[PDB]
Amino acid sequence: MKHSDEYKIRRERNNIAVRKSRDKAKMRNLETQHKVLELTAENERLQKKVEQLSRELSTLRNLFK
Amino acid sequence: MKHSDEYKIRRERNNIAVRKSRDKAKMRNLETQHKVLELTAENERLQKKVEQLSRELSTLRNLFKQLPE
DNA sequence: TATATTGCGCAATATA
DNA sequence: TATATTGCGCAATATA
């Protein structure tokens, strides 16, 4: 029923709502992808810190010898 | 929209390709969500280890500085 | 030549 | 009444 002016307005508003809904869904998907990058970097940083602390513990303990 | 047989064949092939591409993208999203769960559990393990070792080092440093010269 | 990926429209459906 | 979400599809673009 493309000719009705009420139809044209309804499609106009739904197209706006559809694009808004899909935009939000895309941002949620990107946020999840970004969380993977953040956690990967943070886990690498924490592993480096584990290794640094272990080196410092071993150096300090060598003062016993 | 042509509407030749060549056009109908091209639309059919693209429609199949679109569904296959969307299925793959949705599966990637599911894998990414699982990856977040795996990395969060690993992050919690690493935070606990860093805290444990930091306390151990702090206590050992305190012991050594209680020594006289 | 082809398939893969993408933003979008439509209408049905879900929800307020 | 309204906006929000989604299966199906289209055509432009990206890629092989």
Swiss-Prot record, chain A:
It is found in: Nucleus; Cytoplasm. It comes from the Eukaryota. Expressed at low levels in the lung, kidney and spleen. The modification Phosphoserine is found at S21, S58. Residues 8-28 are annotated as: Basic motif. Residues 30-37 are annotated as: Leucine-zipper. There is a cross-link at K65 (Glycyl lysine isopeptide (Lys-Gly) (interchain with G-Cter in SUMO2)). Changing S21A: Loss of nuclear translocation. Residues 4-65 form the bZIP domain. Methylated. Sumoylated by polymeric chains of SUMO2 or SUMO3. Desumoylated by SENP2, which abolishes ubiquitination and stabilizes protein levels. Induction: By ER stress. Important transcription factor regulating the expression of genes involved in immune and inflammatory responses. Also plays a significant role in adipogenesis, as well as in the gluconeogenic pathway, liver regeneration, and hematopoiesis. The consensus recognition site is 5'-T[TG]NNGNAA[TG]-3'. Its functional capacity is governed by protein interactions and post-translational protein modifications. During early embryogenesis, plays essential and redundant roles with CEBPA. Belongs to the bZIP family. C/EBP subfamily. Binds DNA as a homodimer and as a heterodimer. Interacts with ATF4. Binds DNA as a heterodimer with ATF4. Interacts with MYB; within the complex, MYB and CEBPB bind to different promoter regions. Can form stable heterodimers with CEBPD. Can form stable heterodimers with CEBPA and CEBPE. Interacts with SIX1. Isoform 2 and isoform 3 also form heterodimers. Interacts with TRIM28 and PTGES2. Interacts with PRDM16. Interacts with CCDC85B. Forms a complex with THOC5. Interacts with ZNF638; this interaction increases transcriptional activation. The 9aaTAD motif is a transactivation domain present in a large number of yeast and animal transcription factors. This is CCAAT/enhancer-binding protein beta. It comes from Homo sapiens. The gene is CEBPB. The chain holds residues 269 to 332 of 345 of the full protein.
